[PDB]
């Protein structure tokens, strides 16, 4: 093994994990579950030269996806459909901030 | 009640077949909870019968066929229509998720059309086959961990993988409520924040009973999860601009519908001028 | 514009490795002073992520690799850079699996 | 007084040979890349001095500045272009790749090629649109930029060629004014001692701690931290556990930033008791 030169992680979109919390489905009670518990999303990441610049999305897209709200009732559960808004980044740039 | 002949039938593709079923009282068949094209007929000797012709046999037909007693005791037949253009009998998405209230035997309902097919059970991303017994009529039955599984078979000469199933065992236990408040004595026009915390159950119901409830705009509680392994679910009740009368009994009644364990803790909060 | 709605069922993020970003801080390279810059500021590291279908099941690395890479301590003198080398080892995950807990 | 036969910008064919001449009333020399190359110096009976360098087997890398100066700020510069397909952008030192600035000004991305007829464009490292920046085949692109990385592009032969990436970086700079304190000015034997030095405004600074336990006696390594990254807030903490005596005395934090050499210091007295 040779220690290669480190390469900067460029400012660009990369796949991350987004948690579909119950909070975003119903913040009033806790009598349910949501499935799946997490999904993938594209998000700007990487770094810039300085702190006077920041890696920020140049274009974002909000899209609806269907999740399952699972309420239980006597050993049998109640399945229900629910839509959650996912945000993806399509492109980025180091933005002077 | 009787049928010709029973109990398990293996039919050829696109071929034809007739199933009969008679009993002293009226009779009817039902495939998938809904009765298909039948032909009921009453015998002069006080005998009712029912027949249903299965034309153009296709794998998708493979399944349970019953014979009841209408316009808990019946006779079920299982029919296999070996169709090489059909891998695993497609099934509902509600079937793909297996939620459980306790530790018990489980069945992964992945079924084939040909009784002579070798079906193996695997973890979604796993190659080795699992030592679980298979019943071509019901699938794999055994004990599992909360993971995802798929079945595999060799139709023709190509390996086929059914959908993925997900085991999920709910988190249940005894219920104990722990109520508190930022301060049981608040001044007029200030904030009334109470926090009802319960740990052990995943899905619990929260019900707040208080003074400013009946005949008056109620409050919306806000739940939150502390930890996720040993479920620490917290429900807080916040009342900004504390008017009077708010002084009184604030009780948080927590119940889990999985079973039905209940519990309730109350505190008294006074408001001073 | 618009189109006929096609429901999109959410798909679970599988426990597997994805590329994450590690910030290489000055404190990391040398916490005894603050007269240098670090280059590059960040690097890509493979890491395990995603959820297991359940809270008492965790996604965890099964193969870990310590990979060293060389960065630079850049001192600035009268606005002229002096380049010194440093080595930082990255903790890559090459594989994962859901593990009951 | 200095003259070169002939000057000023040359474009020479690869592998050829060229002779440049420089003369003046006092000694004279040719310098390429900061170091005077193989010359043949001489003097004239009329009191004239001269130097002639023989460029042999010209290659693209011979592209660049060549100066004639007076030694054993007034000089004569010649720019020589040696078009050479085997060469893309002229290679430059890691120091030229980082462009550190202390104020807002014009900037030059020094990406240069060997052929003056080559087309060259400026791009944000990852970016396809050519930036509208004037170019000078001798020097590179000059304009105003933000703190990003840039590459230059050119087509040599038929292939697109990319330069190394250049990084524009404006350091955060300002006056220095130290602020020091201690967890407690009066400590007891066997206990910990800890002081803090915080300076704000500069991204890079040198912290210097002078204290009792220093001369003749293992010194203490401070630990630096960054509180706030926008206006740079840097903190240095000197920690001395198991405080022995003698530790009592003056403790100082001298702070200097090397970009503009500003300095500042604050002293505080700590006394240890038994
Ligand atoms: C002065 C000199 O050496 N020129 C050479 C010669 O081959 C020609 O004049 C040119 C192109 O025509 O290429 C070069
Ligand atoms: C044959 O199978 C097709 C496909 O299900 C069906 O539509 C048709 O009714 C069947 N009977 C025939 C032979 O037409
Ligand atoms: C009709 O079907 C129901 C289904 O449970 C059964 O209980 C009932 O006995 C049937 N009617 C007759 C023939 O009694
Ligand atoms: C809940 O736990 C408390 C102790 O913290 C106990 O006193 C109470 O009886 C429990 N609730 C019930 C009745 O299950
Ligand atoms: C709280 O005080 C009220 C008086 O307004 C009383 O009715 C109630 O019983 C108290 N809460 C309980 C049940 O402990
Ligand atoms: C809990 O909330 C109130 C408290 O009396 C009541 O209306 C409700 O039925 C209780 N839940 C149960 C049945 O455990
Ligand atoms: C020109 O000089 C270079 C470098 O010494 C050499 O590689 C090349 O062979 C020379 N040209 C000739 C005459 O072959
Ligand atoms: C540092 O801050 C102090 C005021 O708190 C003052 O000396 C000056 O404004 C700053 N820099 C200096 C030493 O001029
Ligand atoms: C810091 O230390 C002392 C304190 O003034 C003095 O030598 C000078 O100001 C600084 N030393 C250096 C290396 O600049
Ligand atoms: C199975 O029986 C059918 C008669 O219904 C006929 O096509 C043939 O004998 C067999 N078909 C196969 C599987 O070759
Ligand atoms: C009540 O709590 C404090 C009171 O100072 C403050 O957060 C706000 O006034 C109220 N809560 C909120 C943020 O609504
Ligand atoms: C040679 O250059 C240096 C300055 O760089 C200085 O000695 C003087 O300018 C020149 N010497 C002569 C011959 O005047
Ligand atoms: C420093 O001394 C030791 C460890 O260095 C320990 O007591 C603590 O971390 C510090 N002293 C205290 C208690 O402030
Ligand atoms: C530290 O404080 C003492 C007073 O106890 C003073 O004499 C000394 O000059 C101070 N340190 C310095 C050198 O500023």
Curated annotation (Swiss-Prot), chain A:
Main location class: secreted
Residues the record marks as site: Involved in receptor binding: 22, 25
GO cellular component: basolateral plasma membrane; cell surface; collagen-containing extracellular matrix; cytoplasm; endoplasmic reticulum lumen; extracellular region; extracellular space; Golgi lumen
Subcellular localization, as worded in the UniProt entry: Secreted
Entry GO MF terms: chemoattractant activity; collagen binding; growth factor activity; identical protein binding; platelet-derived growth factor binding; platelet-derived growth factor receptor binding; protein heterodimerization activity; protein homodimerization activity
Gene Ontology biological process terms from the UniProt entry: angiogenesis; cell chemotaxis; cellular response to growth factor stimulus; cellular response to mycophenolic acid; cellular response to platelet-derived growth factor stimulus; embryonic placenta development; gene expression; heart development
Record key words, sorted: Chromosomal rearrangement, Cleavage on pair of basic residues, Developmental protein, Disease variant, Disulfide bond, Glycoprotein, Growth factor, Mitogen, Pharmaceutical, Proto-oncogene, Secreted, Signal
Tissue: Expressed at high levels in the heart, brain (sustantia nigra), placenta and fetal kidney. Expressed at moderate levels in the brain (hippocampus), skeletal muscle, kidney and lung.
Cystine bridges: 11-55, 44-92, 48-94
Entry annotated with the keyword Chloroplast: no
Lineage: superkingdom: Eukaryota
Record's disease association: Basal ganglia calcification, idiopathic, 5: A form of basal ganglia calcification, an autosomal dominant condition characterized by symmetric calcification in the basal ganglia and other brain regions. Affected individuals can either be asymptomatic or show a wide spectrum of neuropsychiatric symptoms, including parkinsonism, dystonia, tremor, ataxia, dementia, psychosis, seizures, and chronic headache. Serum levels of calcium, phosphate, alkaline phosphatase and parathyroid hormone are normal.
Self-association state and partner proteins as the record states: Antiparallel homodimer; disulfide-linked. Antiparallel heterodimer with PDGFA; disulfide-linked. The PDGFB homodimer interacts with PDGFRA and PDGFRB homodimers, and with heterodimers formed by PDGFRA and PDGFRB. The heterodimer composed of PDGFA and PDGFB interacts with PDGFRB homodimers, and with heterodimers formed by PDGFRA and PDGFRB. Interacts with XLKD1. Interacts with LRP1. Interacts with SORL1 (via the N-terminal ectodomain). Interacts with CD82; this interaction inhibits PDGFB-mediated signaling pathway.
Similarity comment: Belongs to the PDGF/VEGF growth factor family.
Name of the protein this chain belongs to: Platelet-derived growth factor subunit B
Swiss-Prot record, chain B:
Disulfide bonding pattern of the chain: 21-67, 110-151, 196-252
Limits of the Ig-like C2-type domain: 1-81, 90-171, 175-270
Highest rank taxon of the organism: Eukaryota
Glycosylation sites: 12, 56, 70, 176, 191, 253, 268
Post-translational modification: Autophosphorylated on tyrosine residues upon ligand binding. Autophosphorylation occurs in trans, i.e. one subunit of the dimeric receptor phosphorylates tyrosine residues on the other subunit. N-glycosylated.
The protein's assembly and partners: Interacts with homodimeric PDGFB and PDGFD, and with heterodimers formed by PDGFA and PDGFB. May also interact with homodimeric PDGFC. Monomer in the absence of bound ligand. Interaction with homodimeric PDGFB, heterodimers formed by PDGFA and PDGFB or homodimeric PDGFD, leads to receptor dimerization, where both PDGFRA homodimers and heterodimers with PDGFRB are observed. Interacts with SH2B2/APS. Interacts directly (tyrosine phosphorylated) with SHB. Interacts (tyrosine phosphorylated) with PIK3R1 and RASA1. Interacts (tyrosine phosphorylated) with CBL.
Disease annotated for this entry: A chromosomal aberration involving PDGFRB is found in a form of chronic myelomonocytic leukemia (CMML). Translocation t(5;12)(q33;p13) with EVT6/TEL. It is characterized by abnormal clonal myeloid proliferation and by progression to acute myelogenous leukemia (AML). Myeloproliferative disorder chronic with eosinophilia: A hematologic disorder characterized by malignant eosinophils proliferation.
Protein family (similarity comment): Belongs to the protein kinase superfamily. Tyr protein kinase family. CSF-1/PDGF receptor subfamily.
UniProt-recorded name of the protein: Platelet-derived growth factor receptor beta
Source species: Homo sapiens
Gene, per the UniProt record: PDGFRB
Covered residues, full protein: 34 to 312 of 1106
């Amino acid at each position: 093994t040779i220690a290669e030169p480190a390469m900067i992680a460029e400012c660009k979109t990369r796949t991350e994990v987004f948690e579909i919390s119950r909070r975003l489905i119903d913040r009033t009670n806790a009598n349910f579950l949501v499935w799946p518990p997490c999904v993938e999303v594209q998000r700007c990441s990487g770094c810039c030269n300085n702190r006077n610049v920041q890696c920020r999305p140049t274009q974002v897209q909000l899209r609806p996806v269907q999740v399952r709200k699972i309420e239980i009732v006597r050993k049998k559960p109640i399945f229900k459909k629910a839509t959650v808004t996912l945000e993806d980044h399509l492109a980025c740039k180091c933005e002077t901030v | 009640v009787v049928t010709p002949p029973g109990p398990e039938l293996v039919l050829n593709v696109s071929s034809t077949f007739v199933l009969t079923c008679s009993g002293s009282a009226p009779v009817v068949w039902e495939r998938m909870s809904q009765e298909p094209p039948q032909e009921m007929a009453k015998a002069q000797d006080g005998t009712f019968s029912s027949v249903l012709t299965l034309t153009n046999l296709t794998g998708l037909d493979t399944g349970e066929y019953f014979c009841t007693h209408n316009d808990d005791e019946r006779k079920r037949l299982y029919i296999f229509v070996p169709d090489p253009t059909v891998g695993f009998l497609p099934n509902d998405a509600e079937e793909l998720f297996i939620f459980l209230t306790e530790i018990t035997e489980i069945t992964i309902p992945c079924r084939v059309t040909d009784p002579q097919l070798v079906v193996t059970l695997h973890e979604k991303k796993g190659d080795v086959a699992l030592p679980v017994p298979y019943d071509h009529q019901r699938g794999f039955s055994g004990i599992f961990e909360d993971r995802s599984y798929i079945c595999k078979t060799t139709i023709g000469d190509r390996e086929v993988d059914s959908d993925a199933y997900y085991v999920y065992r709910l988190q249940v236990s005894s219920i104990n409520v722990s109520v508190n408040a930022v301060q049981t004595v608040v001044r007029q026009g200030e904030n009334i924040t109470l926090m009802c915390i319960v740990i052990g159950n995943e899905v619990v119901n929260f019900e707040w009973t208080y003074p400013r409830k009946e005949s008056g705009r109620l409050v919306e509680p806000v739940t939150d999860f502390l930890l996720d392994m040993p479920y620490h679910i917290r429900s807080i009740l916040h009342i900004p601009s504390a008017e009077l009368e708010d002084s009184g009994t604030y009780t948080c009644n927590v119940t889990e519908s999985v079973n039905d364990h209940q519990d309730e803790k109350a505190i008294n909060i006074t408001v001073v001028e």
